[PDB]
From a paper:
Artemis (SNM1C/DCLRE1C) is an endonuclease that plays a key role in development of B- and T-lymphocytes and in dsDNA break repair by non-homologous end-joining (NHEJ). Artemis belongs to a superfamily of nucleases containing metallo-β-lactamase (MBL) and β-CASP (CPSF-Artemis-SNM1-Pso2) domains. The overall fold of the catalytic core of Artemis is similar to that of SNM1A and SNM1B (2 Å backbone RMSD); it has all the key structural characteristics of human MBL fold nucleases, with the di-metal containing active site at the interface between the MBL and β-CASP domains.
We present high-resolution crystal structures of the catalytic core of Artemis (aa 1–361) containing both MBL and a β-CASP domains. The catalytic domain of Artemis (aa 3–361) fused to the basic His6-Zb tag, which confers tight binding to cation exchange columns, was produced in baculovirus-infected Sf9 cells. The protein was purified using immobilized metal affinity chromatography (IMAC) on a nickel-Sepharose column as the initial step. We compared the catalytic domain purified using IMAC (which contained Ni2+ in the active site) with catalytic domain protein purified using ion exchange chromatography (avoiding IMAC), which contained predominantly Zn2+. As observed in structures of SNM1A and SNM1B, Artemis can coordinate one or two metal ions in its active site. Similar to the canonical Cys2 His2 zinc finger motif, the zinc ion coordination in Artemis’ β-CASP domain adopts a tetrahedral geometry, with coordination by two cysteine (Cys256, Cys272) and two histidine (His228, His254) residues. However, in the case of Artemis the metal ion coordination site is sandwiched between two β-sheets instead of an α-helix and two antiparallel β-sheets. Neither the presence of copurifying Ni ion in the active site, nor the truncation of the C-terminal tail, appear to substantially inhibit the activity of Artemis.
Author numbering: 3 to 98, 100 to 258, 269 to 361
The structure:
């Protein structure tokens, strides 16, 4: 499993900050999800930063902004360097001994959550790609010019990639746009009935639902109720679509409505729940409705943080690396199953 270190560049640590990663010459954070931040504010890391002054954390501008809105990560402020998207950037890896290694890093959009990137590393031990978590539609990788060298893909030694749905059963997942349209039309059909018709979006406590909130808000002229929006203080395109006020027809608040509003003018609110949920169809199956009704007032809506099996295979086929290493072992699969699934798309 992925524990922060790529074989080709062991002195850099990505999305893991404990154990062997405490000796990193440089840190990288692909996105602000708890599963990719293990040890990032551990006392032993703070201890290590105080004895190693030339050690920085690199991330996207949006990841820097989101991380530093948390008081518990503010200690990073002096040591965090943002890298502009698709802007190859020279980084020095200094042995705190005499050793000095130069690497070039390029951030590519991952389509996973605000600030989410893949890291392409170029150095004297080959080119490697760390995808972090990603959802890339067919053809998106082909359009990324900085993955190419003279009209073919770069020679990539190793890809460390998001294998969350790397199982043939998860063959196809409806597109970002198909999922959005389904939720938008369901919400529109409900809240246009009267001012007392309201929707609860039952979402996980994680970044990545903002594009759903912004679209619903833009299209229906309504602000989405959330527990907290201060992390978007300097992100106006997200911020103005959100509200902490309960008096709205679209709620994404978290533990009827979590925020406790049950009526307006003593008229009972007419509430439906919509739970963004991963849905998929098999290789030999047809796409069905992104909206699944689970009760008189309850719905599941297709939504994915991660690429389908067909999207993983298309991406890795295209990259054609020597090696592909799964970042994730799916619950009902084995690492041997995942490694062997991808082996035919690799040069070794
Ligand atoms: Ni994630
Ligand atoms: Zn993750
Ligand atoms: Zn609410």
């Amino acid at each position: 499993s992925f524990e922060g270190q790529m074989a080709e560049y062991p002195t850099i640590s990505i999305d893991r900050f404990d154990r062997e990663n405490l000796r990193a010459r440089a840190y990288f954070l692909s996105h602000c999800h708890k599963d990719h931040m293990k040890g990032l504010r551990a006392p032993t890391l703070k201890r290590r930063l105080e004895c190693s002054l030339k050690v920085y954390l690199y991330c996207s501008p949006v990841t820097k902004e989101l991380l530093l809105t948390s008081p518990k990560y503010r200690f990073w402020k002096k040591r965090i360097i943002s890298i502009e998207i698709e802007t190859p950037t020279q980084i020095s890896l200094v042995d705190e001994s005499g050793e000095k290694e130069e690497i070039v890093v390029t951030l590519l959009p991952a389509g996973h959550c605000p600030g989410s990137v893949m890291f392409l590393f170029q150095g004297n031990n080959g080119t490697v790609l760390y995808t972090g978590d990603f959802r890339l539609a067919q053809g998106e990788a082909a359009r990324m010019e900085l993955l190419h060298s003279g009209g073919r893909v770069k020679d990539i030694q190793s890809v460390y990639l998001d294998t969350t749905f790397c199982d043939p059963r998860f063959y196809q997942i409806p597109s970002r746009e198909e999922c959005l349209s389904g939720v938008l039309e369901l919400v529109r059909s409900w809240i246009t009935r009267s001012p007392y018709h309201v929707v609860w979006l039952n979402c996980k406590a994680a970044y990545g639902y903002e594009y759903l909130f912004t679209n619903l808000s833009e299209e229906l002229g309504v602000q989405v109720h959330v527990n907290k929006l201060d992390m978007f203080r300097n992100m106006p395109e997200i911020l103005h679509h959100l509200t902490t006020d309960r008096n709205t027809q679209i709620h994404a608040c978290r533990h009827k409505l979590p925020c406790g509003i049950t009526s307006r003018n003593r008229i009972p609110l007419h509430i439906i729940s919509i739970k963004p949920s991963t849905m998929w169809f098999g290789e030999r199956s047809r796409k069905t409705n992104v909206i699944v009704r689970t009760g008189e007032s309850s719905y599941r809506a297709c939504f994915s943080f991660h690429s389908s099996y067909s999207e993983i295979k298309d991406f890795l086929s295209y990259l054609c690396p020597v090696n592909a290493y799964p970042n994730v072992i799916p619950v009902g699969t084995t690492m041997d199953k995942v490694v062997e699934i991808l082996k035919p798309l690799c040069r070794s």
